[PDB]
Amino acid sequence: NPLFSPYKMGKFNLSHRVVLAPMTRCRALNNIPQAALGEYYEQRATAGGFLITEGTMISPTSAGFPHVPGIFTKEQVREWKKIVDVVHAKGAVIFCQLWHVGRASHEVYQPAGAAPISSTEKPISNRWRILMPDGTHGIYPKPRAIGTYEISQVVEDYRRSALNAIEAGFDGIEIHGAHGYLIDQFLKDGINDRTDEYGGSLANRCKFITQVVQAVVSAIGADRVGVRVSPAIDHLDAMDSNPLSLGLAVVERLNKIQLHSGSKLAYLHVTQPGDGSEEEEARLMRTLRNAYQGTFICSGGYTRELGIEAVAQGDADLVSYGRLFISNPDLVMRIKLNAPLNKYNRKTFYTQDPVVGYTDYPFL
Numbered sequence: 167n168p169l170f171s172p173y174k175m176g177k178f179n180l181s182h183r184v185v186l187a188p189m190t191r192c193r194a195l196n197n198i199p200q201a202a203l204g205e206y207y208e209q210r211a212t213a214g215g216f217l218i219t220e221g222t223m224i225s226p227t228s229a230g231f232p233h234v235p236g237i238f239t240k241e242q243v244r245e246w247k248k249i250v251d252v253v254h255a256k257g258a259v260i261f262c263q264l265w266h267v268g269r270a271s272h273e274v275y276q277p278a279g280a281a282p283i284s285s286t287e288k289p290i291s292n293r294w295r296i297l298m299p300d301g302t303h304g305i306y307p308k309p310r311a312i313g314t315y316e317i318s319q320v321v322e323d324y325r326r327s328a329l330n331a332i333e334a335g336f337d338g339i340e341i342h343g344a345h346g347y348l349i350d351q352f353l354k355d356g357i358n359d360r361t362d363e364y365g366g367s368l369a370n371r372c373k374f375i376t377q378v379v380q381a382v383v384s385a386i387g388a389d390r391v392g393v394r395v396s397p398a399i400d401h402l403d404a405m406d407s408n409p410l411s412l413g414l415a416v417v418e419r420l421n422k423i424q425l426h427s428g429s430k431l432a433y434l435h436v437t438q439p440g441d442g443s444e445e446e447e448a449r450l451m452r453t454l455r456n457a458y459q460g461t462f463i464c465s466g467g468y469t470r471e472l473g474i475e476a477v478a479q480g481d482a483d484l485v486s487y488g489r490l491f492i493s494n495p496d497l498v499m500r501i502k503l504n505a506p507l508n509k510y511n512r513k514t515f516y517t518q519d520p521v522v523g524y525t526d527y528p529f530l
C-alpha cells in the first residue's frame with residue numbers, strides 16, 4: 167500500500183502519507199488550548215505521522231467561531247506546549263494552522279464588538295449564516311476594508327504567531343488561505359473589489375498571500391511553512407471567475423518565494439469540495455500539483471482507495487483526511503488494515519464538551 171511508504175517532507179521523515187487535516191472543533195475554551203485537545207491529538211497521532219491542528223487565531227480580531235485556540239499570547243503558547251509534547255511522545259510531526267477569518271465573523275467574536283476586517287466592505291451574503299456561541303445561526307455583518315498599513319500589521323500578526331508556534335514546540339505552521347477566510351477574501355475576484363495595489367489583477371490579488379508566506383518563511387524557515395488554498399471551493403461567497411488560473415498564479419508565487427529564499431516550503435495543501443465532477447476535479451488537483459515545485463497534499467472527499475490511487479499515480483505526495491479522523495482516532499491503522507470505518511456525528515462537530523463527540527469515539 168503506497169500510503170505506507172515513507173516520505174521526506176523536507177526535514178521531517180514521515181512513515182506514512184495519511185495526514186490529519188485541520189479541523190475546528192471549538193473545545194479550546196476562551197481561546198486557550200485545553201487538556202481535552204491533548205487527549206484528542208494524542209489519540210490520532212502515530213509514529214512518523216503528520217498532524218495539522220485546527221485553525222488557530224493569530225490575533226484578538228482573527229476569530230469567527232467560539233472557543234477556538236489562539237497562539238498570539240504566551241499563556242496560549244504554554245498550554246499548546248503541553249499538547250505538542252504528548253504528540254511528540256508518540257513520534258508524530260505536528261504543524262499549527264494559522265487562521266484569520268476576515269469578514270467571516272460577528273461582533274460577538276470581536277473585541278469591543280468592533281466590525282470584522284476584510285479586503286472589502288461588502289458583507290458575506292445572507293445565503294450563509296454564522297454559528298453563534300449559543301448554537302443559533304446569525305447574520306454576518308458588514309466588514310471594514312483595511313488599508314495597506316493595516317495589511318502589513320496583519321502580516322506581522324502571522325509572523326509573530328509563527329514564532330510563538332515554534333516556541334510552543336510545533337514542527338511548523340500552515341497558512342490557512344482557504345474557504346473564503348481572510349486570505350481567500352484577497353485571492354478571489356468574487357470578493358476582492360479593491361482598486362488599490364491589492365485588487366484587480368492576478369498579481370495584485372496574490373500580493374497578500376505572498377507577503378504572509380514570505381514573512382513566516384523569513385521568521386521560521388521555509389521548510390517549516392505549509393500553505394493551504396482552495397481555488398474551487400465557493401464557501402462564504404468565495405468564487406473566482408477562473409479558478410485554475412488563480413490557483414496557478416498562487417503556485418507561481420510559492421515557486422518564486424522558494425527560489426528567492428533558496429529553500430522549499432514544507433508543502434502546498436490544496437483542498438476541494440468534499441461531497442461527491444470527478445474527472446474535472448481530479449484534473450484541477452493534478453494540474454496544480456504539476457505546477458508546484460515541491461511536496462503536495464491533496465484533500466477533500468478522499469477515500470482509502472482514492473488516497474492509494476493518488477499516491478500510486480504520482481498525483482499527490484500526502485493525503486489529508488478530515489471528517490473520517492473525527493470518528494476514527496485510529497484512522498491510519500484502519501486504512502492500513504482496510505478495517506471498517508465508524509460514522510461521525512455532525513451535531514458534535516462544534517460543541518464544547520471535552521469528551522462527548524470529541525474523544526469518546528472508540529479505537530478498533
Ligand SMILES: NC(=O)[C@H]1C=CCN([C@@H]2O[C@H](COP(=O)(O)OP(=O)(O)OC[C@H]3O[C@@H](n4cnc5c(N)ncnc54)[C@H](O)[C@@H]3O)[C@@H](O)[C@H]2O)C1
Nearest residue numbers: 190293294295296297345399401438439440441466488489
Ligand atoms: N469549520 C470551517 O471553517 C468550515 C470550512 C469549510 C468546510 N467546513 C466543513 O468541511 C466539510 C467539507 O466541506 P464541503 O466542501 O463538502 O462543503 P460545505 O462547506 O459542507 O458546503 C456544502 C453546502 O452546505 C451549505 N453550507 C455550508 N456551510 C454553510 C454556512 N455556513 N451557511 C449556510 N449554508 C452553508 C451550502 O449550501 C454549501 O454549498 C464539511 O463538513 C463542511 O461543513 C468546515
Ligand SMILES: Cc1cc2nc3c(=O)[nH]c(=O)nc-3n(C[C@H](O)[C@H](O)[C@H](O)COP(=O)(O)O)c2cc1C
Nearest residue numbers: 187188189190220221437440466467487488489515
Ligand atoms: C468540523 C470541521 C472543521 C473544519 N475546520 C477547518 C479548519 O480549521 N481549517 C481548515 O483549513 N479546514 C477546516 N475544515 C476542512 C477540513 O480540513 C477538510 O478539508 C474537509 O473536511 C474535507 O476533507 P474530508 O472530506 O476528508 O473531510 C473543517 C472541516 C470540518 C468538517
